[PDB]
Subunit: 157 residues, 12 copies
C-alpha cells in the first residue's frame, strides 16, 4: 500500500535490507562483546578502536530499519528476529586475546562485507537509493575490517 | 584469577549481572525495534521519547559487562548469549500503534524493574558496589516506564 | 564556456537541477507554511518534526544551485523563478489539523520523490556526481515522507 | 536613596515588577507542576514543549527582580511573598490529561499576558527600560500561550 | 475567537505582519538567489556576507508567522501567498557581478526598511509587542543594508 | 494501581518525597530570593556561588516529582502545595548583607539536610532507589551548606 | 546622501550616538583600567564581575558605530575622538581598593545611565530603532551599576 | 561545632576519609608518575588509558576533602600530610615497561580498593552519604584496575 | 593477502587511487602554497576561501590511502611518491595576485576533476564503493573550482 | 615593595610595558575605528580580517597591565593615560576606502612593531619573561601587518 | 641512550626540571590543600581563583616530566620523590582564613618564582627550549602570585 | 622592500625558515605516510598517536610560510619546492611494522630537531621572534620524538 514507488520491486529490497538489518544488529552486539572480552597487552587500543564502530554500525541499523519502513514493510530488530535471518554461528569467542578476537572478527566482517557487496549488485537495478545506503555503509565496514586486519600482518599476512 | 575481593561472592554476582547484561541487550534492541515500528498520530513523540532510553540502556549494557569482567568472569553479549539467559518471550509486536507498543513495553519494563529490584536485594549483602550500579540503573529504568505508562492514564489508567 | 566536462550534457543536467532547485524552494516554504499552521493535540511533535526537514531541504537548495552554477548555468531562486518551474498547485492548506496537513504533505512529497527518482535515472548516463547529489537528497526526502506517513496509518493505511 | 533617575516614579514601577516577579514565580512552579502531572497519548510532546518555557520564565523572574534591586526597592521571592502578591487561585489541577491542563494553563497565561500588557501601558510614562523588559517577556509568554492554545482548536476553536 | 487582547486591533496588525512575512520570504529567497549568482573578484566576501542574513531573515520569517498565529489569524507561507502580498517585481537580476547585485539588493532592502518602518508607526497604536518584533528586525535589516551599501561609495557615493 | 512494586510501601514513600519536593521548591525560591537580595563587599562571590545551587535543587525538584509520579501518586508543585507541606516559616530576610543571609541560609539548610537524613533512614527499608535519590541530593545539599558555612567562621565558628 | 529614511533627523541621531560611542569607549577602557587596578580582600570578585561588562560595552560600542554608519555619518573611534566628545574628567583613580574604585565607577556609570536616558527621550521622536538600541544597552548598563552599588550599602547605603 | 548532624560519629568518618583523601593524592601522583615513565611498544595506549584516571581520582580527592570540611574537620592535602597517613611504600618503579608498571599498579590499586571497600562497611552505619561517595568512587577505581589487569592475562592470569 | 573480494580487480583500483592520493597530496600542498602567496585587494577573501578546501582534500588524502590499504596494497604518500605519480608540472606560481593564482588553480583543478571523473567511469564496473569515494570527492572538488572560477566571470568569463 | 625579583630593574620594565600598554589601547581603538569606517568592494574581507586582531590586541592589553601590576607598579588604561604616552598622532583617517585605511594602518603598525622590537632588546637583559610576552605579541602583530600589507602590492609593493 | 643533542648538557637540565617537577607537584597539592581549607567572608572568591591555577600547574607538572623523559632521564613524581627534592617546609597552614592562606601562599610562590627564575638564567646557555618552558610557566606563576598578592595591598601592602 | 625592519638580516632568516618550511612539509606527508602504512598489533595506538602530530606540524608549516611572507620573501610549498630544499632521502619505508616505522621516524625527526636547534642558534642574533617560532615548534617536535622513541627502549635503549 505504501513505498516510494514500486509495490513489488520494493518488497524485494525491503527483504534485502532486513537481512542486513539483522546482520548489523548481530554485528554491534558482537563488536561490543568483543570489546569487553578483548584482553592482553594492547587491549585498550582495540577496545577503543572498536567503540566508534559499535556506535557507527548501531546507526547503520537505524538507517536500515528506517529505510525498510520507508519502503513500506516492517523492520524486525528483536534478538528473535536476528537469529531468524542470521547465517553465521553466533560469535563463539569468549574472554580471549586481541589476536584471537580480531582473527575472529576478521572472519565476521568477512561475511558482512561479502553479503553487503552482494546486496549492492542486487540493488543496482531494483532501488538505487538503497544501493547507496549500503554502498556508504560498506566503505565504512570495509575500512573497519582493514583496521582489524592490520593488527595481524607484515609482508602481506 | 582476579576479583576486587571474594573469589565466590563475586562469581555469584557475576551471574546476576550476566542475567542483566543480557536483559538490557534484549531491551535496547527491543526499544529500538519499537522505535522504528511505532506509528499513529503521536509517533514522533514516542519515537524520540525512546532514543535517549536506547542510548542509555545500551550504556547500562557496558557498565555491567565491564563490571563482570572486573569481578573476574567473562561477560557474554552475542545474541546467542541473550537467548540463553532470556526469560520472557522476545518482543511480540511488529508494525503497530503507539498505544499497542507502550502496553507492550510497559510489560517489558515490568520484567526488568522487578528483576533488577530483586537482584538489588540479592546484592545488599554480597557486593554493594554492584548493588549501586543496578540501583542507579533502576531509577532511570523505572522512570522511563513511567514515561511510557503516562501515555495511557487519567484517574489511574 | 565553463562546466566540469560536457558543454551540452551539462546544460541538460543544469536544466534538471533547476527544476529541482525550485521544487525544494517551494517545499521549504510549504514545510515552513505547514509548520506554523499545524494544530490539534499532536501539534508540537509535528511542528518540530518538521524544522529539521525545513533546514535540510533549504540546504538541499544551496547544493542544487551551487551545482548548477558549477555546471556553468545560472541558477534561479526568486519566487517568480519557482512558479515558472512549479508543476503543482501551491500548497492550498491553510490553518488546519495535523492529520490534514500531513495528508496534504504526503501528496506534496509524492511529487518530489517521484520527480527526483526520475531525474536520477535521467542522470545515470548524463552526470554521475549530480546523480549522487539527488540520490543523497532522495533518501532523506523519502525518509521524511515516511515520518509524515507513519503519522496516519496502522495495518497499511 | 538609589535608583537610576526618578526617586518616586521608580518606586511605582518597582511594585509593578514585584507583581510580575510574583506572577512568574507562580508561573514557573505552575508550569513545572503541570509538566510532571500531564498525561495521555500526547504527554511527552507537552511535557517537553513546557521545559524551555519553565527555564525561560524562571529567567524572566531573575531579570525583573534584579531590575527591582536596580530600581532601588528589594524584590521578594519566597512563596510567602507570592501568595501575598498573587491574585489567582493556585493551580487547582492535579494529575490529569493534556487537554485538561492546557485548558487550565491557557487560562493561567490569560491572567499573565493581560496583567503584563496592563503593566506595560502603566509603564509607558513611568520607565521605558522596564517597559522593554516586559515587552520582551510579553512576546515570549504570548508565543507560549499560542503553543498551548494550538492544542485544542480546528477552524477557530 | 483567540488573540491576547483586542479582537479587531489584532486582525489589523495580523495583516501588517503577513505583508512582512511575505516580504521576508521573498527576501530570503532573493538573498539566497543573489548569493549563488554573485561573481567577480570579490564574490566569496559577499557570497558569505549574505549567509548569516539569509538565516537571520528566514528566522524573522518564523517570528512574525508564529506571531500571526499568536494574534489569531493564520499566516501564509507558500510562494502563491507571497506573490499575492508582494509589491515589487521579483529580483530580475541573474548571474552577475557583486556591484550589480548589491545595487539591486540595496534597492530591494529599500522597499523593506521603508515598508517596515511604515508598519512600525502603524503599530505604535495597534500592538506594541508586535511593534518591538519589527523594530528588532529593523535594526538588523538596516544594518545589513549598510553592509551592502558600503560596497560602492567613497566620500558619500 | 501503578507503582514499580508495593502499593502501600510506595504510597508511603510518595508522601515522603512530596514533603521533600516542596522543601526544595521553597528552597530554590529562598536561594533565588537570597541571591538577588544579597549585598556588601562579598556580594558577587555569593550572588554566584548560589546560582548553581539554585539550578541544582530546581532539578532536584524535577527528580522528586518524576519519582513520585513514577511511584504512582501525583506530585504537587504549586505555591499553595508548598505552604501546605512547609514546616518552617518562609525566609524572612529581605535586602541584607551576605553575613546575614548566609546565617539565615545556614539555618534553612539545617532544616533540609536534617529532614533529608531522616527520610533517608525512613527509606532504608521502604524503597532503596528513592533512598538513592536523596542520598545523592544529600551530599550535594550538605556540600552547599558547607560553602555557606565556610563564609562565617575560623577556629570552628 | 544615504540613511534609511530622514536625511536630517538621522544626522541629529547620528551625533547623539557618537556621543555614546565615545562614552562607551571611555567606559570600556575605564572598566578595564579599574579591573586591573582593583585590590584588597575582594579583588577577584570584582576584577571578574567586570570582565563580562567590558566585553559587553565594547560590543555596545560596535553596535552604535555600526549604527552611525548605517545612519549615514562616519563614527569616530580613536582616543582623540573620545577626549573630543567626552564630558567627564578621565578616571583619576589609580591602584586602589574595591570600595574606592566602585565608588568611583558608580559615579562614572552615573554619567552614562543619565546621558543615555536623556538620549533616549531625545530619540523618541527622532528614530525609534536607534532608541531601542540604547534602551537595550540601558538595561544592561543599569544592571551593572546595581552590581557595583550593591557592594557598599546596608539598609539603603 | 559544625557537621551535618553527629559531633562524634562524623569525626570518626572525617578521619576515615582523610585516609582515603591521602591515598588518592598518592594515587594520582603515582598514576601520573607511571604515565610519563611507562614505555615500550604499547606506551601510548596506557599512557592515555591513564590520563582520564588521573583526572578522575584527582577529583575524587576534591570530593573527599570537600566532604571532610563539610563534616567539620579539616582535610590535609600536602605531601607531608600524605606520607603521614600513607601505608604503602611509595611507588618505587621508575622508567620501566608497561607490564612492569601495570604489575606495579595492579598491586597499588589492590591496596586502594581493599581499603575503600573496608571504609564502605565501616561507613554503612556511621554516615551513609559518605558511604555513597566512596561507593561511587569504588566502582570507578575497581574498573580502572580491571583495565590495568586486562593488560596481563589470558585464561585467567 | 587481503582485499574486500577480487585479488586482481582491486589491485587495478589500488593504482587508480594511488594516482589520486598523490594528486590530492600535490593539491593540498599547492592550495596551501597558493594560500600564503596570494596577494592584492581581495587576498583575505580567497586566502580563507581556500583553508577549508585544504583541510578537506587533505582528508580526501586519508580516505583513499586508508582505502588503498583496505584493498590490500600499500599507499605511498612521501613527496618522492608524488613526483613519481605526478602528471602536471608542479605549481608554477610564486608570490602573485589572486587573479593570477586562481587562473593558475583553475587549471590545476582542471587536471583533477577530469582525472577523477575518468577514474570514476573506470571504477563503475570494477569496485563501486571506491567509485562512491571519488564521486563524493568530485562533487566537492568541482564545487571548489566553481568558487575559484566565479572569481573572474560575468557574461561567461 | 612588591615585584618578582628586582625593585629597580622591574620599575624599568614596568615603564616599558606601560608605554606598550597604551600603544595597544590606541591600537585596538584605531583598528576598531578603521573597522567600522572601511569601505569599497573589499570591505567585508577587511572589516572582518580585523575583528580577530582587535580582540587579540585587546587581550594583549590585559596581558601588559596584569604584567605591570605583577611587576609591582600600577598600570594605566584611561584614554587620558594613553594620550599621555602616545607618541603618534591619533589615527586621522575617517570614512574611507580599504586601500587608504590599510596604508594608514600599515604605518600605524610600523610604529608598533618598531617600538616593540626595541622594548624587546631593552628587555633581553632586564626581565626575560616580560621579554617573552612581547616576543609572543610581536609575531602576531607583525603577522597582522603582513595581512594588511599583502592587500596592496605584487612585485614588492 | 637518548636526548635531543648533548649527552651531558641535558643530564644537567634534567635535574633542573626534576627540581621543578617536584616543586610544582608540591605546589598543586598545596594549592588544592589551600583551596579546600580556605574560609571567611571571601572564601569562594579565592577558592575559585585557585582552581584554574591548580589545573594549570598540574599541567606544568606534565610538560616538564614529559620534557625530562624527552631529554633522556626518567622523571620522578611519587610523593616520596618530592620530599627528596623539596626545599621548603611543607605547607604549614590548616583550616584558616583567606588572609592567612594567601600570606602563606605568597611565601610559597616566592620560593617558586625565584627558583624558576634562577633555573631560567641557568638554562640560557645549556638548553634554550627548556628555558622557554619555564619562561612560559614563569609568566603564569608570577601572574598568579600577583592575584594572591593583590588580596592584601593599597599604598604598597 | 617590505619586512618588519632589516632588509638583509631578514632575507637571511627568510631562507632559514624556508628550509624548515620544506622540512615540515616532508614531515607531515611522511608522518601521514607512516600513519596509514603502520601495521601490527599496536597499529591503532600509533596510527593515532600520529594524527595530532600531523595536524600540528601541518600548522607549523603555516606558521613558517606566513612568517616568511611577513619577513618579505615568498614561501615555497609545492612538492617541487621541497625536493629542492630537502636533504634526507624521502622516507623509503613502506607497508611495515610499527617498530620498523618508528625506528624509521626516529631518524627522520633526528634530522628535524637537529636542524631546528641549529636555526635556533643562527636566529638568536638575527631575528628573535622567528627564533621563538621554532623554539615553540621545537619543544613539540622533540616531544613527539620522545613518543616515538619510547616505543622501543627499556633500560635506556
Amino acid at each position: 500500500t505504501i513505498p516510494g514507488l514500486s509495490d513489488k520491486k520494493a518488497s524485494d529490497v525491503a527483504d534485502l535490507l532486513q537481512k542486513q538489518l539483522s546482520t548489523y544488529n548481530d554485528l554491534h552486539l558482537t563488536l561490543k562483546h568483543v570489546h569487553w572480552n578483548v584482553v592482553g597487552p594492547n587491549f585498550i587500543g582495540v577496545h577503543e578502536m572498536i567503540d566508534p564502530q559499535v556506535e557507527l554500525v548501531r546507526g547503520y541499523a537505524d538507517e536500515v530499519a528506517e529505510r525498510i519502513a520507508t519502503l513500506g514493510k516492517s523492520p524486525k530488530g528483536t534478538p528473535g528476529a536476528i537469529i531468524k535471518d542470521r547465517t553465521w554461528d553466533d560469535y563463539s569467542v569468549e574472554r580471549d586475546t586481541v589476536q584471537a578476537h580480531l582473527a575472529a572478527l576478521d572472519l565476521v566482517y568477512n561475511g558482512v562485507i561479502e553479503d553487503t557487496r552482494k546486496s549492492i549488485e542486487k540493488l543496482e537495478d531494483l532501488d538505487l537509493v538503497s544501493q547507496d545506503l549500503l554502498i556508504a555503509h560498506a566503505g565504512e565496514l570495509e575500512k573497519f575490517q582493514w583496521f582489524v586486519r592490520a593488527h595481524l600482518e607484515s609482508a602481506g599476512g
